[model samples]
Target: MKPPQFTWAQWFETQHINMTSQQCTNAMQVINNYQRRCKNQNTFLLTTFANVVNVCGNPNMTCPSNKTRKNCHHSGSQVPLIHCNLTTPSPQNISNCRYAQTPANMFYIVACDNRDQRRDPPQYPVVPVHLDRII
Candidate 1:
């Protein structure tokens, strides 16, 4: 089988701010069913990649990533954001899953890596690979 392809656009599609109320619920379903299974929580950043990438350019601080053992970087400034928490039971199918959106403004933390630099747009030499947390 061929390996998977990951790009900045993919990250933007899943993690970028692009939804409203019911839109959040639909996004959760798309994540669980299409992206992966059993994902119940996710957050979207209400800013451009240009701004988010700057976090790693001159990070406010660094800490261990919640999802990975490696260290992640935090943004130097607070940015608007939203959270999606899955609710309801997936008794029959992923379509049954629901989500709740919560808004907040905080310094978002993310894991940065250049693994895809050669493949991604040159403008995004180093990009936020994973959204670690908010503080």
Candidate 2:
């Protein structure tokens, strides 16, 4: 099957998922009529699979191994199962972590590919990323 091309972020308010692959995709693809922007009480939360991956350049911290859509048999509501494909960080060879704001006051920050940071990765890491956020 062709990959899902249209990237989007829908809102379920502060309502998270059951962490099931079926549940997360269904809710995100479905219950998106409500959303929010600017992190707050009712905002989207993010999850990264540290165990599944060894940080890009460093084997110390697990990061998404290759630029491929790896299937996650495990359950994580914040991360996608089928759609979670790894992309080499632009020309920088990093993970593309994205964020967006919908007109419905809904905002979700889900997908994030790493920059293969291992030795000095930040716990509350911050990095430069171009986004469709300005619109």
Candidate 3:
């Protein structure tokens, strides 16, 4: 039997993001919503692999975010932002564990839209996604 491909979703949940599958699904819904908006507006978004590396952090520390930058007790620059072309085949595939490419420039959608709603000040300002994936 063929070994199953190591799913990006599995890797992200268990290792990288440390989020639940339900959370990941919600994130994807946000990405898809952004793609749809881009389709209507004739624009796109892209991120680089380097961005991922930066966000994942190195031996010294963990990734940084806007909130972390201010409140973080540790001393170091914020984690590097991973920039993958969400429009590309590989990144899109890696994003949701699906065999489809995303519309260009969808990363902004996921970042700004799909964050935890309970976060103070609301990480994302708009209703970036229409669908909510959580039960």
Candidate 4:
């Protein structure tokens, strides 16, 4: 299954990125620090599970190319999907709880992994509920 796509705008909005630059930077730094902690402890289980499960199905999935491909069992193709494409920030989409255009300020976003890019869509097999959650 393919994970949903996140446009710069969508990512910003969903993540509430309209805060001041200092706030954005501080938030990103905090997130990065947390990520480092997780990496050091090998306790980033949710994403680690997502990554391992994705790789188990497709070995060749890569970034940019994986944006539309469905190769993994955990990808959206195998389950109900939610797409979050980036949109230019406008008054309608921007709110106190939502951001507008702060993707440019993110410090550690990465492209989709190779396995995640090649996930296959569902056909005969009914996807598992846990797998659906991963997507």
Candidate 5:
């Protein structure tokens, strides 16, 4: 028989056995805070939270906005940009694009519109990604 893979919460528990009882309670508080932040927020019931494997499969997962968001284009599609090649041809208008899952169950789309780093806000916001695995 094969062993089942552990979820992040389960994995954390296994790693923390060296902690004292007081430390265990302290650790539980972080989970409690995570749950509190997730409750009654419509987005929580569908997406993963802190890589938790359970506590999310309810019908109330509906968000008033999910229905509205389906019609939208790719989130990165309409990003405003500066500078481009005139002599040569290229389709990469955006650069350094990324998505971050925040602690509040919200996702962040981080990116830059160009490669030049000479400007005020600067560019190259996301460094570089190859094969797209958590750099």
Candidate 6:
């Protein structure tokens, strides 16, 4: 439970693209109640996890890391995404907070990590660990 590589994959699945604001709102509740609570903002990529992982291998550009000094990659092409922002900046009960969705198409950045040990079947050589930012 500590490394959270598997947990990160699960979180990414739940935070994947949605067709409606209602769906996005519902996902946020799961995150607030179960995963990370009071995460005021998140960007959901409108694409498959496999495609996202591919960005690490075939990035259009390497980005300056805001956190780590290396392994930041920018998407090769623009992808659709949704930005979810909490209506209340500091909600006493974030589980009850509502969110607004903003749709846009942009190149995104993700930080990659190669330390996952799940190996029943070989994993992708490099996997995305963080959604660095949207460009």
Q: Which RMSD values do the candidates have, in order?
A: 3.7, 16.1, 15.1, 15.3, 22.3, 3.4
Provide the overall lDDT of each model, using Cα atoms, as 2-decimal numbers: 0.66, 0.25, 0.26, 0.27, 0.22, 0.67
Best by lDDT: 6
Residue lDDT tens for model 6, 36-101:
466678788888778987887864344455753567788879998888888754456666777788
lDDT accuracy of residue 20 in candidate 3: 20
lDDT tens digits by residue: candidate 5, 1-135: 111343332323332221222322333333333333211111111222221212111112222234422111122222221111122222232111211122222222211122224421232222210001001
lDDT of 3 by residue, 24-134 (tens): 333333344433321111111122323433323323221143433221122123332212122323333344432222332222211112233453134223221111111
TM-score of each model, paired residue for residue: 0.76, 0.19, 0.18, 0.21, 0.16, 0.76
- lDDT string for model 1 (19-126, tens) is 433466876665566554535678888887677777767644455556434547778789888788877757557777787888889887777777464577776667
Q: Runs in model 1 with CA error above 4 Å?
A: 1-3, 16-22, 66-71
Residue-level lDDT for 71 in candidate 4? 35
Full-model lDDT, candidate 4: 0.27
TM-score of model 5 vs. true structure: 0.16
For residue 112, model 3's alpha carbon misses the true position, in angstroms, by: 14
Please rank every candidate by lDDT, starting with the best: 6, 1, 4, 3, 2, 5
TM-score pick, better of 3 and 5:
3
TM-score of candidate 3 against the unseen true structure: 0.18
Cα lDDT tens digits, model 4, 29-121, are 232232222111101111232333333354333233245544323232332112222232223322212212222211112222222223433
Off by over 4 Å in 4: 1-52, 62-77, 85-88, 91-93, 96-135
Worst 10 residues of 1 by lDDT: 1-10
Instruction: Please give the lDDT score at residue 12 for candidate 3.
Output: 25
Task: Give candidate 3 misplaced runs (Cα > 4 Å).
Answer: 1-29, 34-76, 87-135
